[PDB]
Every structure is written in structure tokens, then in C-alpha cells.
Design a protein around this nucleic acid. Structure first.
Ligand SMILES: Nc1nc2c(ncn2[C@@H]2O[C@H](COP(=O)(O)OP(=O)(O)OP(=O)(O)OC[C@H]3O[C@@H](n4cnc5c(N)ncnc54)[C@H](O)[C@@H]3O)[C@@H](O)[C@H]2O)c(=O)[nH]1
Ligand SMILES: Nc1ccn([C@@H]2O[C@H](COP(=O)(O)CP(=O)(O)OP(=O)(O)O)[C@@H](O)[C@H]2O)c(=O)n1
Ligand SMILES: [Mg+2]
Ligand SMILES: [Mg+2]
Ligand SMILES: [Mg+2]
Lengths: 329, 1047
DNA sequence: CTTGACATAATCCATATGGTTGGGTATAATGGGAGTCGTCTCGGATGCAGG
DNA sequence: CCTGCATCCGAGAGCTGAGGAACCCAACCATATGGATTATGTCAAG
């Protein structure tokens, strides 16, 4: 019941493997069905992708949920093909069925490859699913004309999909693929250098061993960005009562002391302005962002009163001297 | 065991030998630079190709292994740590009564932890025997068929025992071949998995027959061999030889089960708490288990690389990745519950920590699940585990201590020594026995009277399987070595322990470990005779290696010239901060030109006086009430103790800061700090660090630092003295990038540490304790003229309340006080071993001599008896303490022999109406100091999510008002106070801002609002797809978010 | 209270560099792996046994 | 068909304090840097 790994393995084992004849037959059908799809694209004049999707939708059946109406209209549009041309549609249907059978039969290679990537930030089932994605890519791109076995071409794509998924999804803070490769290369070089030196190498030794374009500072930055975050729920102490996040203060919201200081400062500014004339206080508030938060320029404040900018500036300097007097007073 | 790492059908990697190099850094450098004191481990291996025979041999570096110091601890990441031993169930074969059904038994096979599954065997009520493994009932006859047993073999092996063998037989299984039986068993144990033959073979082999997966230890092998009376070949339950399975344990186990079920004599059930059935995993075994786990992970990696690597060009170095081994070792030495921050308050603390035994830990018991059976003192604990020393809270009985004479054998079983007795004659032969071996004999008590070395007593008290008995001397086989062997080291330091209740002896034993070293520490007046050995074995003091002569003496050095002619220099540890903040220093006790024999003391360690353990001070005490100041365990002390620097301790604190790299620019440690007058920068040096010798008070700067503010150009981020701290700066340490041996974290440019010292005198609120469990807080410090005094003018130093004695029943402190009175007037000290030491008559003779000195000294000067003494003698005559008809001097001597003297009140000059017990007592200051605990907060930091005040004194936190405090406030009907606690003081952000502003403006605080924690609760309930809505009286929505969450 | 003349910050598009992202590899490969057995009773749901 | 009876599983078990594992190759948006333009503010004067 539980343990989905066993369930998936059982469902994979329910599908029998393939022999050389069956494998080559399926690959040939897939290629010829794709050729038939493109020939139908030329015949009807419509986009090849859309007819591919309607053929696939009609094959997969109602059970699998572009919509029924358009697939039906274009499927009936496919029924106006005189003769020697509906054979292409039959070949395409057989090819899509062959593709499904090929994927189902070769699912076990995905598991065999993916079982050696555990312990790198992704669970077994996730690796299996990404390997399945790579297997679909391999099926689509396979060329039987080269007489090579299917698994020979499939392994490369499965491994590439697994590696790319690991680079994309293993970290909470996403690090680009090239930087992931750089971090892996740094770690491998450090491990080999430590094995040679008999101790942990210093950053200068790693910088020398990386090659041209690497100094100790760059190694330090690279190692710094490779640090992964720790959990706020990490238990501190033996008893299950203390967490890490219990020791972290909030630095964003203003403190009661800070809020009281700001309130008193606003009251003091209001008193200082009310000491001045109301007109000059309004001009100061407009210019210093006290009416509407935003700071104005002299032209805007003057335009409010229909006066030039320099008159606003001079009356603001008179109000500044008045502030000097009031502070002295 | 892990090697050879064979690869499947090829390459074979085989281990040859290993070596350990020398540490790259010494112990003190490891402590200073925050490094691990370790040694490199090198393994020489050879890779052999299966067919070619081409052998490539290479020595590969595997990493570092931590090294134990001489005293028995480790230096991990610069911190001193101790690995605590673990007690657990011994592996082997056990038989226990069936709890549900009487008359039936369950057999259990138990391997080493994480080395196989527990296997149960049980006779089902329908007659078929069934084995449970991995929670899977199935018939044992199936596995017996797999192991290659015929009907005739089983019938002849178990025919005797009756109908059990008939219940065993089953013809359906027996018609199959061991291959068919193997497949059938595999399909029961792994239902659904395709039943390939080699797959089933591999699974069953790994279940019971693979030495790399299943492992009965050497202890389990020994226990099984002795219990079942058979011989093991290895450590597995079965062998895989010639392609088939051979049984080793199963049939003997089932035969024992049947014989026990049939009532056959010579078969018994097992006591799982018996100390012959429980064993100790020490530091070496735990470390080796973690090492084995790491080695298995390394083997897995090696096999993977063998499969993937180019077989033509491959070497041992390329195959081996040593990261898993290092990771396993680091995990064990840094995160294992059994790896603990070493307790070094005083040398006895560390010694006790090293001898600890724990039932908890990885694979151990759980503190909430352990019920009664594991916390009990078993009869087999006698001489092996101390019945007294254990924690008082929820860990009682789960953490214990090794007994003083006990030894953990090579198999993990605790052994204790006994003298051999032959023909009523006690000999010098000493035999160390396990509990199982001990159970076979009659063991006499160590206090048995002897004449020469012959038992001179017609009736001897003895133990037979723990049962007390009275026997003749002939029936005695062994005798105990000493009473000391029953108790732990800490409990062996309590004199007159036989007069103390066990609970208070527990308290005394535990409290001796919290004693703080004192600058004028003294050895106890009454000792048990074990102080010197404790000091010597803690490696705290310095002793001469050989006979020689002292050449140079200094406060930091002793140079000795040995008879070999070689000069040897011993540096002295001076003012060093322990893990607990106490100062540990060594002080020279030798002079230039002095001759020293082998083992002679050269320097005293912390809490040591001339090589004796010195945990406190000997003070003059009176046992009497005093104006309610010693009410309910409080203590009154004299100011004269403070005047002569008694109970004065030295404490050191470490403050650390870092300058790192930031996106807005690097931080820097410097003196150039803005917005501070030169009064705030007096003590800083030219590099921005406080100078050595400067006094620092709360608010003073220790290290200057500036950070780039940004915020749309530098700001103060200096290190300051926290509230309630300060003292004299004694040390500064700076670690910079690139410095040899330094390993900073990425981004950290430098780190600066400052060591600040304090000289703490005794004050009100400090905790004092004696060795008998009497503990109390100092409540009053009186001037000398107010203290009660003897008629010769001598004041007492300490007043203890007599009400603490009768219900605690620790009478040993009274006898200690009497002997201390005798020693105080006679000027001597005493060694009184536990259960064999001073008795009342000897104390009375010593008191008679002491009274002759104490009274003849007065009579010589030309003084008679005081009038006040006559009045007190009249009162005591009425009390029945003295016999009527004697002279005043005779009655005074009669009182003195009872340990009582006439005492005068310093406030009035009138005598206390009755004689008062006065004498010398050994009292220690405890690490619980009121200085470190007083804390208060008005406002401060708040937590990220709940927006509530943080916890802890270090974080400037607030007190928790929990559920029962809320219950009390509700029971008072104090609604407004409770609402204030819930909102205005914890997490009503607008409410607390407004309250603070109103208070500083002189108004009263406004009404509170919805606390932030309830908004968090609403949001967390929405995340579970639940619509929580607040409604008014008309069932219309009320928006508690002020409109911030409505689109 | 304007009126006028530089002297700069703030915005505006035009590219040019690094950083980032998508694609590709062809002998053949075909179902995983750690783990855990020392709680105690109690209460409801439930499959199994009898009548 | 009812009923009772072990059977299984789930949710509980005092508070406060202190405590810390591939590599490469090629196209492509994003952001940065330059130069020129757009209002902003000052120094001098009428
Ligand atoms: N509310 C509580 N108060 C407690 C508790 N334990 C003690 N106390 C009070 O402290 C008083 C003095 O404590 P004591 O001198 O016994 O404590 P020590 O610090 O000397 O420790 P030990 O007696 O040696 O052993 C106590 C053990 O239990 C731990 N302990 C120590 N203090 C506590 C507290 N407060 N809460 C919970 N657990 C506590 C501590 O870590 C130890 O492992 C005592 O009379 C009580 O009034 C306790 O568990 N809860
Ligand atoms: N786990 C714990 C341990 C202790 N405590 C509290 O600490 C007190 C002292 O217990 P104690 O054993 O130190 C003395 P006490 O019981 O007061 O003795 P007396 O009759 O001789 O005066 C208890 O009474 C509880 O209030 C607790 O709440 N939870
Ligand atoms: Mg206590
Ligand atoms: Mg009490
Ligand atoms: Mg108390």
C-alpha cells in the first residue's frame, strides 16, 4: 500500500522487455509515423504541431483529458482525404502507438541509471521522473538507421536530464548551472589536493590548482555563495523546547523607543513650523515632504502658488532664518 | 571487516595496514585557534586485477581522527569535550515469561545495535512455534527446513520434551527441498518482490548469515555460548557454506526453550536488569562503531567508482573518497548526545564527568518512556554502580556513576574485586568478578572482625545472590575489599556518611561538583582519606617525575634538575578560563634548592591545598536560630569572612567580535568611531581594542567597529560590555586571514576576543553548601560585633538553623561539627573513613583533651567562671543536660563533651539561655551566583514571526507568562491586568508603541488591540484552506487586518 | 520680487559586455535500500468469532 | 442476521530556567556604461 517506490517498481515490471526485432520495429514505426505526420502537414497546409496533437489526442482516447471541439473539427477535416493519403494517417497513428510502447518498455533503464544519483538533494522518485523526461527526449530523437541499440542513445539523454534537474532543483536558493559546475569543480579539486597534501588545502593552493583566472579572493567568494541556509526549526539543546528561530530578533519593525522618538520629532517639527507664518510653513512642508511624503522642487511649489521658483527659495531661506531664531529662542 | 572490497563479476581492493601520524598542532594551539586536536590516518592498500595479477600498492590519506588527551578528554573545535559511556542491554539469547499467558516463555535473540534485527521465538497457543523478525510472524519450521533439518533429526533432538515437538511438525513444509523452502520463506518475508533464486539467497544470507550485516558481538557470542552450552564458530546465527545454510544458534535456542517450558531442572528465565545482562559501551567502542559506519559508506563509494571507472587505468588513490569517513567522525564528535561539553568547574567535576554512565543516547532509552524498572537500584549494582549518586529530576536512575573500585572488562561488563577466603582465613588474593560470577558464592562483609587474618567471629554477615544471611566462617568463600567499593568517588568524600539519609547524601555528592575554586581554599578539617588521590588523578597539580633537586622557581615556571643530570622545565598554567568561566591556575609550592623525591608535589592546582582536594573553607559555626535571618534554609555569615578574603573567587569572561565582508563594503576594526566624545575612547588602543589592565563597566566599548550604513557613511557597530558585567581586561587575542592554522568562515576578515576578569567576594544571595546536603543562600552579613561569641571573645563565622536537621536526617554534619570543635581547640585535622572511622567515644576523648586546653588556658590567666556562665549552668541543670551536685567547671566540661558551649549575644552581652552547639565546619561556595542571574527588561528585541519578546538573559529577554500564570490571574478576577499582559506587553504592536509613548508623556496607557499572534493564527488557518471569519453581533464580517489584505 | 547666466543631478536611449540558459553527446547498459525491535493505558473502529 | 472480543492505531503524558559526485558549445536577454538631454538649484544682478 505505502512505499510508492515498490508500487512504481511493480508497475514498471508489469511491462515486458523487448527483443531486437521488436525494438527495431517500434523505432521504424515511430520514424515513419513522424514522416507521415509531416506529409499530412504538407497535404493539408496546416501547422504540423497541431495535427500532431490531434492525432495524439485521438489515440490517447477520451480517458486522457486544444479541446474536444477543435480536435473533432480537424479530425473530420482529416476525413476529406481522397485515397492513398489516409494511409499516412494510419501510419501516424501506428507510429504514436509505437512511441508509447517504446517508452513503456524502456522505463526500466531509467531506474537503472537513476539509482546512482541518490543523496544529492533529490529524492529517488524525482530522479526517476526526470529520467523519464530524458527518456522521452531520447525516444523522439532516436535514429534506428545507424543500427545502434536504443539504450546506447537513451543513456546519454537520461543522464543529461537527471544532471540538469539536480542543478536546477537541489538548492533552496537557486544557483545557475554554470556556477553549479564551478562549485563542483572547486570541490573536486580541493578534495584531490587534500589527498595529495595530507591536509585541508588553503585557498591559495586551490586557486593555483584551478588554473588561470583564479585567485584566492575568487575562491573565497565562490565558497561563500555555495553556503546553504539552515533551518529556523533546528533543535537547540536536548529537550524538545528550544529552536534556532527562538534566538533571532526582528530588525525591520520600529521599536517602541524609535516610534516614540519619531512621534516626538514630528510634534517638534509641527511646533517649529506653527511658530513660523502659515504661508511659509506650507511652503516648507511642500518643499520638505511634509504634506504628501514626496519632496517637491521649487518649480512645482511655485506653480501651486503661481509664483517663480526663486521667490519660493528666498521665502524658504527667510523661514530657515526664522527657524534659527526659534531654536535660539 | 569492510575490506576486501570485492567488485562483482574484475578488481579487488584489499586492506594491508594503517598508521597514525603525529598531530599538526599541539593542544594549547588547538585551544587558541579553535582547532580539533587530531592525528592523520593513513591506510596502505593494494588493487589487484583478478586475472592479470597486476598489483598497484599505494598509501592513501583517509583523514583525521581526534586524539584523547592525558586526562581523558578531547579538544573538538577548540572546546574540551567528554564522551559519556552508555549502558545498554547485552547481546545474546534471553528467555522471559510470556506476560499475556502464564506458563509459556518467549525466547529473544539480540545482536549488537544496528547490526541485525531482534528475533523472537514463541510457542503459539495452537502448538506451532513461530519466529517474529521485522514484525513478521512465520513458522520456525520453515527456516529449520532451510537450514537442512530432517524429520528424524528434529524428532531425535527434541523427542524428550513431550508434545512441543509434535506441535513443531508440519508435513506440508517438510515435503519441500531447502531451495523450495528458501523461496517460500523469501515470499513470506518480502511479499510481492519477484522470487529469483539468487535474490532470495542474498536476502536470507544478509538477514542472519552475513558478518557484514549481522553481528552478535564478542559479548553476545560469549553470552550465547555460556547460556546454551554450545560453541560458536563466528558471530552470526547461520553460515553459508558449500552454497547452503548451516545452523548455529536456532536449534540450541529452541531446545533450551522446550526444556524451560517442560520444567526441566537447570533452565531459568533472565533478569534483563541484571548487571550480568547489561554492558557498557565506552568511548572506544562508540567511536569504532561510527568509524565502521563511515568505512561502509566508503566501501559503497569505492564499489561505485569500480563499476564506473576505467578498469585499465585505476589506482587505490582514485578509488577512495574519504569524505564519508571524515563526516561520520565529525558527526560523532560534534553532534552526538554522548559527546558533551566537559564540566570543569573544579577538578572533581571533570573527574566525575569522565566516570558517568548514561542509559540515554542514540539507541538508548527515552526519558519519557523509561518506567521504574530501569531507574531502580538493582541488587547487582553492589560494588559496580553507586546507589547514591544520580540526578534528582526526570533523569533519576538513568544517569549513574561507576563505583570507586569497579572496572569495565574487555567485554563491557563491570567487575568488582573480592578477597579469596579459604578455610576461614582471609587471603591477599583479589579476584575481579562479574555479577554472574558473583552470584555463585557467599561473600562476607568487609567489616568482619579478624585476628591476624583469620575470621574471629562465630556469626558472619554475608550476601548470597544479594540476600543478607548469617553464616559460619567456614561457609564463607569471598570477602569484600572495602566499604569504599560500594559508592562513587564523590560519595566517598562525605565523612560520617553512615549517619546520613540517602537523599541528602545524594544532594551532597552532587553539590561537591558545583564547588568553585577559591583563592584561599582549604582542605577539610575532617576528611575521608581520598582527597589526595582525587587531586593526583585529575592531572591538575604538578609532581616531580623522578628524584631530584629544584633549580628555578617562578610564578610561571619550575625548572627541576633530576639525578639523571637533565634539566626539565614545567610551565605553569596561569589564570586560564575553564568551560564554566572559573579561573584555573597552578601555584608553585617548592623553593629553590629544595630536594624532591619521586612523586613529590611541585605546584598546587585549582581547589588544592598541599596536594589535598580543597573545595571550600573551614569556618566556625553555631547551630541556632537567629532573628529569622536563617529562616527556611537561609544562612547568616560574619563580615570577618569578607575581611580576610574567605570565599573569594576569580572568574573570567570571553567577548568575541568579527569583522567580515559586506556588499556595502567590508567591516573594519578601528578606533575611528563617529559621534562619541574622547571620554568614550579613552581605553581603546591605536587599533581600536581596549588595553590590558583597563577596568570596564556596563556600556563601555571593548572593540571598536564601523559598518557601512547604506540606507540611501559609516555607523557604530562596536562591542560593548553587557549590563551587569565588567571587570579588568586581562587578555586580547586577534586572528587574521592567512595566519598559520587559522580557519575562519568564508567572508570573515578577522576575529577579536577579549578576556575580562572579576574578583567576586561573598555577597547576599550566594549559595553555600556542606558535604551532607545542607545548602542555603546567604541572607544577611552582620558586622563582627553583632555575632555570637565565645567567652574568650572569639566570634563565630556562620549561623545555621537547627530546624534543617530533624526532617532531613543528615546527622553526619553534627558529628563533623563536634570533631571540628575538638580539632579547632587541639589544632589538628582528622581522617575518618566511611563506615570505618571515628565513633562517639573517641570524639568524646578528643573533646576532653580540647576542653582541658580551652579551660586551662583561661584558668592560667587568673579567671574563674563568669556569672553569666553560672546562670546558663542553672538553666542547663533544669534542662537535664548536667548532673546536679557538681562544680561549675565540671558542669562546663559535661556540656563540652556534648559539643556545647556557653555562648554570648554580641548585641546585648547576655548569654544565650541554653548551651549552643559550636564547631568547625567545611562549607563550599557553589557556582550558582546571584550576579549571573539578576535580569530585568522594560523593552527590547522581538521575535520574527510572533512579534513577542525574546527569551533569555543573554538576549535581553522577557519572562514567560505561561498557562498557569494566566490561570492564577483569571482566578483572581484581574481581567485588566491579564489583558495588559496579553496585548500591551507582548505582541500588540500599536498598543505597545502607544503605551510607551503615553507613559513617557505622562498620560495613562490606552486600550489594547488584537494581538499579532491571533492574526498569525488566522493566516495559518487560511493556509490549511479553512475560512476563519470574525463577526460582530449581527453576523457581519469584522476586518481585523485594517484593510491591508482585501483586494 | 523678479531676471538672467552657468553648473550641476536626473532621466533617456544606444549599444557592449558578462552572466545566464538551452542543446548536445550513438558499444551497451533494463526492479532500491536503510532499518528496529526497553510505553501505558485508553478509547473508538473494526474484522472475526460465536450464537 | 445479531452480539461480544480481542486487535490496531492514534494521540496523550507539569512549569519556569539555560541552551547553538560531467563537460562543452553556442545563442540571448539583463544590466552596465556613455553621451546627450531635462529640469533643479545657486550667484549675481537689476
Ligand atoms: N520550577 C522548577 N523549579 C525547580 C526545578 N528544579 C529545581 N527547582 C527550584 O530550584 C531550587 C534549587 O535547585 P537545586 O539547587 O536543586 O538545583 P541545581 O541547579 O543545584 O541542580 P541539581 O539539584 O544538581 O539538579 C537539578 C537538575 O535539573 C535541572 N534543573 C535545575 N534547575 C531547573 C529548573 N529551574 N527547571 C528545570 N530543571 C532544572 C538541572 O539541569 C539538573 O540537571 C529548588 O529548591 C526549587 O525551588 C524544576 O524542575 N522546576
Ligand atoms: N521537577 C521539579 C523539581 C522541583 N520543583 C519545585 O521545587 C521545589 C523543591 O523541591 P526539593 O526536592 O528541592 C524540596 P521541597 O519539596 O520543597 O522540601 P521540604 O519539604 O524539605 O521543604 C518543589 O516543591 C517544587 O515546587 C518542581 O516544581 N519540579
Ligand atoms: Mg539539588
Ligand atoms: Mg519548601
Ligand atoms: Mg528551593
Amino acid at each position: 500500500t505505502s512505499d510508492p517506490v515498490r508500487q512504481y517498481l511493480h508497475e514498471i515490471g508489469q511491462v515486458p522487455l523487448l527483443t531486437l526485432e521488436e525494438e527495431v520495429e517500434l523505432a521504424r514505426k515511430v520514424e515513419e509515423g513522424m514522416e507521415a505526420i509531416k506529409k499530412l502537414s504538407e497535404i493539408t497546409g496546416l501547422d504540423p504541431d497541431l495535427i500532431r496533437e490531434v492525432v495524439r489526442a485521438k489515440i490517447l482516447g477520451s480517458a486522457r483529458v486544444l479541446d474536444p471541439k477543435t480536435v473533432e473539427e480537424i479530425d473530420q477535416k482529416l476525413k476529406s482525404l481522397p485515397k492513398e493519403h489516409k494511409r499516412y494517417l494510419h501510419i501516424a497513428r501506428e507510429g504514436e502507438a509505437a512511441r508509447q510502447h517504446l517508452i513503456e518498455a524502456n522505463l526500466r533503464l531509467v531506474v537503472s541509471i537513476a539509482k546512482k544519483y541518490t543523496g544529492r538533494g533529490l529524492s529517488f522518485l524525482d530522479l526517476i521522473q526526470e529520467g523519464n523526461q530524458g527518456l522521452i527526449r531520447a525516444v523522439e530523437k532516436f535514429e534506428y538507421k545507424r543500427r545502434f541499440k536504443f539504450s546506447t542513445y537513451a543513456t546519454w539523454w537520461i543522464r543529461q536530464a537527471i544532471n540538469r534537474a539536480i542543478a536546477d532543483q537541489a538548492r533552496t536558493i537557486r544557483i545557475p548551472v554554470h556556477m553549479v559546475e564551478t562549485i563542483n569543480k572547486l570541490s573536486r579539486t580541493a578534495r584531490q589536493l587534500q589527498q595529495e597534501l595530507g591536509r585541508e588545502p588553503t585557498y591559495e593552493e586551490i586557486a593555483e590548482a584551478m588554473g588561470p583566472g583564479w585567485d584566492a579572493k575568487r575562491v573565497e567568494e565562490t565558497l561563500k555563495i555555495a553556503q546553504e541556509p539552515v533551518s529556523l526549526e533546528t533543535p537547540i539543546g536536548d529537550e524538545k523546547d528550544s529552536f534556532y528561530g527562538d534566538f533571532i530578533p526582528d530588525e525591520h519593525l520600529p521599536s517602541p523607543v524609535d516610534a516614540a522618538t519619531q512621534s516626538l520629532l514630528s510634534e517638534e517639527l509641527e511646533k517649529a513650523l506653527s511658530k513660523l507664518s502659515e504661508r511659509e510653513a506650507m511652503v516648507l512642508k511642500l518643499r520638505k515632504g511634509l504634506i504628501d511624503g514626496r519632496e517637491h522642487t521649487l518649480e512645482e511649489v511655485g506653480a501651486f502658488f503661481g509664483v517663480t521658483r526663486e521667490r519660493i527659495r528666498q521665502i524658504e531661506n527667510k523661514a530657515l532664518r526664522k527657524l534659527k531664531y526659534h531654536e535660539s529662542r | 571487516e569492510t575490506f576486501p572490497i570485492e567488485e562483482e563479476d574484475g578488481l579487488v581492493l584489499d586492506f594491508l595496514e594503517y598508521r597514525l601520524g603525529e598531530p599538526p598542532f599541539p593542544q594549547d594551539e588547538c585551544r587558541e585557534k579553535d582547532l580539533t586536536y587530531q592525528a592523520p590516518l593513513y591506510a596502505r592498500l593494494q588493487l589487484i586485477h583478478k586475472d592479470t595479477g597486476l598489483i598497484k600498492e599505494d598509501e592513501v590519506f583517509l583523514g583525521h581522527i581526534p586524539l584523547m588527551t592525558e586526562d581523558g578528554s578531547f579538544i573538538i573545535n577548540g572546546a574540551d569535550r567528554v564522551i559519556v559511556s552508555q549502558i545498554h542491554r547485552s547481546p545474546g539469547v534471553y528467555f522471559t515469561p510470556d506476560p499475556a499467558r502464564p506458563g509459556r516463555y518467549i525466547a529473544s535473540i539480540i545482536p549488537l545495535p544496528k547490526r541485525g534485527p531482534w528475533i523472537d521465538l514463541e510457542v503459539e497457543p495452537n502448538g506451532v512455534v513461530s519466529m517474529k523478525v521485522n514484525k513478521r510472524k512465520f513458522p520456525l519450521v520453515l527456516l529449520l527446513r532451510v537450514l537442512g533439518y530432517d524429520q528424524e533429526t528434529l524428532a531425535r533432538e527434541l523427542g524428550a520434551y513431550g508434545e512441543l515437538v509434535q506441535g513443531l511438525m508440519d508435513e506440508s513444509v517438510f515435503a519441500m527441498r531447502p531451495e523450495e523452502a528458501l523461496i517460500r520463506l523469501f515470499t513470506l518475508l518480502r511479499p510481492g518482490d519477484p522470487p529469483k533464486r539468487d535474490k532470495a539467497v542474498a536476502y536470507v544470507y544478509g538477514l542472519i548469515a552475513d558478518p557484514r550485516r549481522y553481528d552478535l558481538g564478542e559479548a553476545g557470542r560469549y553470552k550465547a555460548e555460556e547460556k546454551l552450552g554450545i560453541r560458536l564458530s563466528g558471530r552470526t546465527l547461520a553460515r553459508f557454506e558449500d552454497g547452503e545454510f548451516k545452523d548455529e544458534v536456532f536449534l540450541p535456542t529452541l531446545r533450551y526453550l522446550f526444556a524451560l517450558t517442560a520444567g526441566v531442572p537447570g533452565h531459568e528465565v533472565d533478569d534483563i536488569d541484571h548487571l550480568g545482562n547489561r554492558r557498557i559501551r565506552t568511548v572506544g567502542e562508540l567511536m569504532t562503531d561510527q568509524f565502521r559506519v563511515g568505512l561502509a559508506r566508503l566501501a559503497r563509494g569505492v564499489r561505485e567508482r569500480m563499476l564506473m571507472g576505467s578498469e585499465d587505468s585505476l589506482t587505490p588513490a582514485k578509488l577512495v573518497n574519504s569524505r564519508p569517513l571524515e563526516a561520520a567522525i565529525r558527526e560523532f564528535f560534534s553532534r552526538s548526545q554522548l559527546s558533551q561539553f566537559k564540566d570543569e568547574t573544579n577538578p572533581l567535576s571533570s573527574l566525575r564527568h569522565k566516570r558517568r554512565i548514561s542509559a540515554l543516547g542514540p539507541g538508548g532509552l527515552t526519558r519519557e518512556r523509561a518506567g521504574f524498572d530501569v531507574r531502580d537500584v538493582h541488587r547487582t549494582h553492589y560494588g559496580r554502580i553507586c546507589p547514591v549518586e544520580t540526578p534528582e529530576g526526570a533523569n533519576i536512575g538513568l544517569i549513574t556513576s561507576l563505583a570507586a573500585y569497579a572496572r569495565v572488562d574487555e567485554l563491557g561488563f563491570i567487575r568488582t574485586p573480592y578477597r579469596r577466603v579459604v578455610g576461614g582465613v582471609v587471603t591477599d588474593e583479589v579476584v575481579y568478578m562479574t555479577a554472574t560470577e558473583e552470584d555463585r558464592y557467599t561473600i562476607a562483609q568487609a567489616n568482619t572482625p579478624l585476628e591476624g587474618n583469620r575470621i574471629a567471629a562465630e556469626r558472619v554477615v554475608a550476601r548470597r545472590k544479594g540476600e543478607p544471611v548469617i553464616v559460619s566462617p567456614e561457609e564463607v568463600e569471598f570477602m569484600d575489599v572495602s566499604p569504599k567499593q560500594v559508592f562513587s568517588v564523590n560519595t566517598n568524600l562525605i565523612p560520617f556518611l553512615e549517619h546520613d539519609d540517602a537523599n541528602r547524601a545524594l544532594m551532597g555528592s552532587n553539590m561537591q561538583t558545583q564547588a568553585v575554586p577559591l583563592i584561599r581554599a582549604q582542605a577539610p578539617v575532617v576528611m575521608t582519606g581520598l582527597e589526595e588521590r582525587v587531586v593526583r588523578d585529575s592531572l591538575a597539580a604538578l609532581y616531580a617525575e623522578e628524584d631530584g633537586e629544584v633549580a628555578k622557581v617562578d610564578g610561571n615556571r619550575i625548572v627541576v634538575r633530576y639525578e639523571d643530570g637533565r634539566l626539565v622545565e614545567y610551565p605553569l598554567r596561569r589564570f586560564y578560563r575553564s568551560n564554566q568561566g572559573t579561573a584555573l591556575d597552578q601555584r608553585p609550592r617548592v623553593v629553590v634548592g629544595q630536594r624532591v623525591r619521586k612523586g613529590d608535589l611541585l605546584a598546587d592546582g585549582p581547589a588544592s591545598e598541599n596536594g589535598f582536594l580543597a573545595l571550600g573553607q573551614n569556618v566556625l559555626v553555631a547551630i541556632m536560630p537567629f532573628d529569622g535571618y536563617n529562616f527556611e534554609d537561609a544562612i547568616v555569615i560574619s563580615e570577618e569572612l569578607l575581611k580576610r578574603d574567605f570565599y573569594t573567587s576569580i572568574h573570567i569572561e570571553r567577548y568575541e567580535i568579527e569583522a567580515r565582508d559586506t556588499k556595502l563594503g567590508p567591516e573594519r576594526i578601528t578606533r575611528d568611531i563617529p559621534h562619541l566624545s574622547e571620554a568614550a575612547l579613552r581605553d581603546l588602543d591605536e587599533e581600536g581594542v581596549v588595553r590590558i589592565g583597563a577596568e570596564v563597566k556596563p556600556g563601555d566599548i571593548l572593540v571598536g567597529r564601523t559598518s557601512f550604513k547604506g540606507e540611501s557613511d559609516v555607523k557604530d557597530t562596536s562591542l560593548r560590555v553587557p549590563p551587569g558585567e565588567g571587570g579588568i581586561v586581562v587578555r586580547t587575542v586577534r586572528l587574521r586571514r592567512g595566519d598559520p592554522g587559522v580557519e575562519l568562515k568564508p567572508g570573515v576578515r578577522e576575529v577579536v576576543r577579549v578576556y575580562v576578569a572579576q574578583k567576586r567576594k561573598l555577597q547576599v544571595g550566594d549559595k553555600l553548601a556542606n558535604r551532607h546536603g545542607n545548602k542555603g543562600v546567604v541572607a544577611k552579613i552582620l558586622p563582627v560585633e553583632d555575632m555570637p561569641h565565645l567567652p574568650d571573645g572569639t566570634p563565630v563565622d556562620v549561623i545555621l538553623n537547627p530546624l534543617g536537621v530533624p526532617s532531613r536526617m543528615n546527622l553526619g554534619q553534627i558529628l563533623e561539627t563536634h570533631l571540628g570543635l575538638a580539632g579547632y581547640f587541639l589544632g589538628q585535622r582528622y581522617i575518618s573513613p566511611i563506615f570505618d572511622g571515628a565513633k562517639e567515644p573517641e570524639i568524646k576523648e578528643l573533646l576532653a583533651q580540647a576542653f582541658e586546653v580551652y579551660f586551662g588556658k583561661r584558668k592560667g590567666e587568673g579567671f574563674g567562671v563568669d556569672k553569666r556562665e553560672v546562670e546558663v549552668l542553672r538553666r542547663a541543670e533544669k534542662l537535664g543536660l548536667v548532673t546536679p551536685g557538681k562544680t561549675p567547671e565540671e558542669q562546663l566540661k559535661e556540656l563540652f563533651l556534648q559539643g556545647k558551649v556557653v555562648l554570648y549575644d554580641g548585641r546585648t552581652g547576655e548569654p544565650i539561655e541554653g548551651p549552643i552547639v559550636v564547631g568547625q565546619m567545611f562549607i563550599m561556595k557553589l557556582y550558582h551566583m546571584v550576579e549571573d542571574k539578576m535580569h530585568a527588561r522594560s523593552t527590547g528585541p522581538y521575535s520574527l514571526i510572533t512579534q513577542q519578546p525574546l527569551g533569555g538573559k543573554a538576549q535581553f529577554g522577557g519572562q514567560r507568562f505561561g498557562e498557569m500564570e494566566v490561570w492564577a490571574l483569571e482566578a483572581y478576577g484581574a481581567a485588566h491586568t491579564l489583558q495588559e499582559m496579553l496585548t500591551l506587553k507582548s505582541d500588540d504592536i500599536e498598543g505597545r508603541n502607544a503605551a510607551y509613548e503615553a507613559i513617557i508623556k505622562g498620560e495613562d496607557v490606552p486600550e489594547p488591540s488584537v494581538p499579532e499572534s491571533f492574526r498569525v493564527l488566522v493566516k495559518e488557518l487560511q493556509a490549511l484552506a479553512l475560512d476563519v471569519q470574525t463577526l460582530d453581533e449581527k453576523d457581519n464580517p469584522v476586518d481585523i487586518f485594517e484593510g491591508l489584505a482585501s483586494k
